[PDB]
Subunit: 400 residues, 4 copies
């Protein structure tokens, strides 16, 4: 059954037509987000009984990469939707799934999030203060709120305060984006990933109801520290990022090759008759396509392990740690590959590819160079080294 | 996992003695006999013919496992399966019905006499002269005859000469290594792969009987030029090499880390208290370990595709060509990785890992540096680039 | 050291405004006039003819300093000296006695209309003038140019078609149309669009040598073939200058804006071991590349002053220049992209930081001619003792 | 004239003829050390008065690189002689120089050293200097990595004071005869590469060191380095010696590969190549590496000239010394990466028979480079350059920075 991927391929073909002009303007890709809504693919992981497509993580990852190859901002928004959905699905009650998932199919929910902040260090000042009847009031500003614009629901994270049952506990809630007191600020103006709407969101006395809470306050800390099933969220999400990088890489390589076939001039001073026969043009394409073939094959194999563990009732700390090691290794390789490829392929195309800004090939490097900084690859490398040398699995967190 | 556990236990024994054995060079007779007794030489022979009925994924994992311990034994074992692949793809069912039970019962370890030391690799001078009964007489000298010592049979290639039906056609045969006129010269003295017995073999009036011939004269050339199933021999064999390189990489990385945990000193000049906590030491293991995880995951996917096509009655040129591209890609990546890693890991261990020659860690680089030159990775890179850029599959041959 | 101080002060003023100017593209007229007022366009004109009587080492260092502040102004400045070098190597002493004092008095900033089977023809007229027709591409510095160095191929010529002629002409000569069609990834203010020649008359006292003389000089490896190594080392210094500017600009950001990765236990970004390793690797390569380029620049000056140059001397210089360009190309391309990893996501999240200018400028200009063939040329020399075949690119 | 460099070039020619067979055996290259003695080059930095050659550091560095290109062990022994000489010259008294330097010319001294130890880390020194009467010291303990300790006319030796009323833990250095009673050169050097540098252990049992053999007072070196006084030049001088070893090895390896490619490599006729020397990828490998080598070598010449300029100054500021160390460290980083990559990757330009035939011996270049580049970790040289560039902090002077 290749139907969902055919749908994703068609969406990607449509986005390529206009990505050049859209990403320059920046702002919100409303018409494209609506196309994704009409496609149904946002419901890939909702069971058919709940109205969804009942598909699997390997299908999701393939779709992410295909869309990302055409438009990295739409690939990112799509992918982050599934990170948000993964978190919801790992913590939602049976009651929450029974009503939210049919509603997500019917209202075509495209999820956004508000998690990170811009404080002195990456570790939170957005507060959740208890109310009567079990409610909480959210106050503060979040940064890098990907897909916060035109989101139907926001996955929001806060830390308890003035809480008789414990301060500093992490609350997560799934709330309407138009809930009173929620202000999406629209201040995203980035080198690349220009249509991800990853600006700031301000919360002024925003009410969260108990039926919107994803677990009890602090449950995510307990689930991660114990390697409970929700600790799969991080390898899942980091593998989503990996697939954005491989998709950008593939898109840049294909776009460059089409330029070389149709536009490059041979370096006829050295007796080359066509650029596509030049030994150094061929070596550049061979070196990068070969690394891409291995990385994609490896990413498929890790995607299948995500699915296998996703279906288990219990995942051991060793199973989760090994997956996280495999995922981090994939992200490392994909980061280096995409950053190098999107810059060096100009050398296979020639000066005219840069002399006309409107050709727009630099979008691939700008998108990859922006996103690959999401968290430092130097510390993903350290985690894999600490694992290999010292037999220490990474400590489960939002980042590892 | 039975077969793989046997391979692991063999490797563990080989590790104890490889340092002393490979200095001397020469034939690792005791270790070859232990491989004979293991049964693993029969991995791909069907259970009906007395073999293990196993698959290429298992063979590839066993090759890498043995090579991680002793690269020469891994090579001999791996090349045995390249020789077996050729016999299987070209021999008649009647031949295999006789040979394969005999190979089980007599514990056959196959060697080959194929390449030559002439002006270029596309220039064979070992000749097959047709005799009236359908026999041939082989004359000339072969080079790089891996596993030619202590071999139960040699896979021999020659070109027809004095042939009224056409000179220059390639014939292949499977013959006893002690047949009259066969002289294994024992002149292998190399930088690495020191116990592969890849010396020269001289044929003086060597008779080949019709029931020892593999196909008809020039049939292998016809199969290559057609991209038909017997041309799978090359991607199969090139993926064997790939697994040697991944196995050496993994062995070198594990041996380095044992030294780093046990013997490396902290660089207290800079405030480090434990070498295993040094950030640059950790970054070296992390970078190489990550690349190895991705390469090993991708290699497993290509190994499954080898098994799929291996089981088909007919293979198209597009199936074979796509597989060869995937193999070539894995070989490029594995080559770069093992060459870099076996040299750079010294930087994670310190000067005394090199100042004490008897630690012997340079064996990994010597073995990898020798074997990776088998055929030029620059032209594997070209082949992948010519495919990606120009949609041309590699021209099938003994190398591509 | 005065010339270099003047260049340093020019560069300081250029850094204030480059971020806003380069976005707009077009012609940096005010900055070109500041260069005119500095006197530095006359660095290589002898004091006898009213210039500064300075050396190629000073010129190269000045180019790299200006480039580190504004790569387009560094390129325009550098190319001026490529154009000047061509004039000096092919002009008659009588031509120089007129042109160079005029260049000083009128503060000439030279431009180029050479690159484009040449579509720009020179048809001989009976007096020895030539009529030029066609459109040139990549005419760097073609706007606001006091003179253009122009190349064309003879056509309808009893004395031989396909011979290269070169001339130095006014940019407002009748029939010259500078098109302003330059909208590029980087080098955005170099005015490297096209120039259209419609029946443009070039007079005999404007011609540089005789038709085909530049080809014969290349084939001879004689002194005028120095033009290529000279110009390729100009490019090298553009790349070194961009490298240095990017590194210093990144470091400023790291000191002022980078957050530490507290989840690793890091207290300060400037103490992060991996941040420090990025700056160390790139700063170390940059030091060596800069030191090596100073030595090649001294050799340019040595041969520049000779009456005669052998093909061996020229070929050895070209190999040294090619080597420096190769190292400088790899360095600037890798550095301008990887330094983001030392600064953090917010350096890319805020487009207005504008750090991507360094990569865009370097990524654009390094494509001028393919570094893969500079590598082949050095390898063919080392392995086969064959010098590069002289051309406009080697 | 180029007389001294001509002498070095002729020495290196002769060493090349026999290095392949000599380094296999390891042990002491006595005959070659004697040829260096007869050459007079060990006196390069002794004034023409005192009988030396009155030459400069740039000449020294060029000779080191030239000899190293032919025989890395002899290049190392030669370069380390000048590191030892530099330390002596920076700390010796005027009467010590008046006696030692003519004696070094007369007796053709080839210096070695016994400095490092094999304890828990490189700061953990346990070879002790215990006071004797009349200002002498007794040395006890074992040193490791004692380069040139065999066949040495004098050993430069380092110890830490113990049971010393004038203060314990102070570093003393002395220049002593290698056959003084109680010095035992152990002959246990058996290395991957640098196999003829005699960098094994030396054991000191009751060895007497006299006051006129002490190089400054105990602890003077700590003050001179910490303060950036003139002796703090010893480290950039010596690290630049290491840099020229790597560039010498790189050049010798590149030239040996090119000889093999021209005469033994086969064309990959499968792809239509008729001559390996016209193969586009063979040419790219030689071009990449020759290009980086030219730039590294040109750069090294500039830094060598700066060494000479500061060597001649009466006082060097911390900023001048720190700039020099950063330039030296930069040169060493680039040269380290270059030699390690080149000596491995050039096999790809040569072909499989270059590895298949052990006796070709090309792996010597990698073995020598891979061994010596580990002397001190390049990762911390990189960190030191980065700390300077980002934080404007010069390296803290030490025996390594
Ligand atoms: C080939 C070689 C020669 C050396 N020669 C000396 C020497 O002459 N004097 C000295 O103090 N250290 C010498 N060293 C050692 C370094 O100063 C340092 O002690 C050593 O490289 C650190 O070892 P480790 O990284 O295993 O901990 C030498 C090291 C090598 C590899
Ligand atoms: C920024 C830039 C400036 C250039 N300036 C000049 C110039 O002033 N004069 C000239 O003859 N060529 C100039 N070129 C010409 C390059 O040689 C040419 O664009 C390149 O070789 C074409 O590569 P392609 O045909 O594969 O696209 C310039 C190129 C670039 C990228
Ligand atoms: C393109 C982009 C999208 C991001 N999206 C999210 C997001 O959806 N949710 C989130 O919590 N953080 C998001 N982040 C934040 C990063 O995880 C992290 O906060 C940031 O890289 C820190 O910046 P620094 O390295 O300068 O300190 C995003 C970052 C980037 C660059
Ligand atoms: C360690 C090693 C083992 C080899 N074993 C075989 C072999 O068993 N059969 C064969 O036909 N060629 C073998 N080869 C040789 C390659 O097929 C090929 O002939 C090689 O490229 C030598 O050529 P070169 O020196 O020109 O690069 C081997 C090569 C090496 C380095
Ligand atoms: C190259 C050519 C022919 C061969 N037969 C077995 C191996 C092998 C390698
Ligand atoms: C550390 C201490 C003293 C030394 N003398 C020569 C090298 C060296 C290293």
């Amino acid at each position: 059954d290749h139907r969902a991927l055919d749908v994703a391929t068609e969406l990607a073909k449509t986005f390529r037509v206009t990505v050049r002009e859209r990403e320059r303007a920046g702002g919100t890709p409303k018409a494209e987000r609506d196309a994704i809504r009409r496609s149904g693919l946002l419901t890939l992981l909702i069971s058919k009984e709940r109205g969804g497509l009942g598909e699997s993580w390997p299908t999701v990852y393939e779709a992410i990469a295909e869309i990302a190859s055409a438009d990295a901002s739409l690939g990112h928004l799509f992918g982050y939707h599934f990170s948000n959905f993964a978190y919801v699905d790992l913590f939602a009650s049976p009651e929450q799934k029974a009503r939210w998932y049919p509603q997500a199919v019917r209202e075509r929910w495209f999820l956004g999030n508000a998690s990170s902040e811009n404080n002195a260090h990456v570790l939170w000042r957005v507060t959740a203060t208890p109310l009567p009847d079990g409610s909480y009031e959210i106050n503060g500003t979040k940064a890098f709120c990907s897909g916060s614009a035109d989101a139907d629901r926001l996955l929001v994270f806060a830390v308890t305060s003035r809480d008789p049952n414990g301060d500093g506990r992490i609350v997560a809630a799934l709330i309407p984006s138009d809930r009173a007191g929620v202000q999406v600020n629209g201040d995203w103006d980035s080198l690349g990933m220009r249509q991800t709407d990853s600006g700031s969101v301000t919360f002024s006395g925003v009410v969260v109801y108990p039926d919107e809470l994803l677990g009890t306050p602090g449950q995510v800390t307990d689930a991660f520290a114990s390697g409970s099933k929700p600790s799969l969220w991080t390898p899942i999400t980091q593998l989503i990022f990996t697939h954005l990088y491989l998709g950008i890489a593939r898109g840049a390589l294909e776009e460059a090759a089409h330029y070389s076939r149709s536009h490059s001039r041979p370096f006829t001073l050295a007796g080359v008759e066509k650029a596509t026969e030049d030994p150094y043009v061929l070596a550049i394409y061979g070196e990068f396509a070969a690394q891409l073939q291995v990385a994609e094959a490896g990413a498929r194999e890790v995607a299948l392990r995500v699915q296998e563990l996703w279906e288990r009732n219990h995942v051991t700390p060793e199973q989760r740690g090994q997956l996280m090691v495999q995922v981090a290794s994939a992200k490392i390789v994909a980061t280096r590959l995409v950053i190098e490829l999107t810059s060096r392929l100009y050398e296979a195309m020639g000066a005219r590819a840069a002399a006309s800004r409107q050709f727009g090939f630099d979008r691939f490097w700008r998108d990859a160079r922006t996103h690959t900084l999401h968290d430092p690859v130097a510390y993903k490398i350290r985690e894999v080294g600490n694992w290999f040398l010292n037999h220490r699995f990474p400590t489960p967190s939002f980042y590892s």
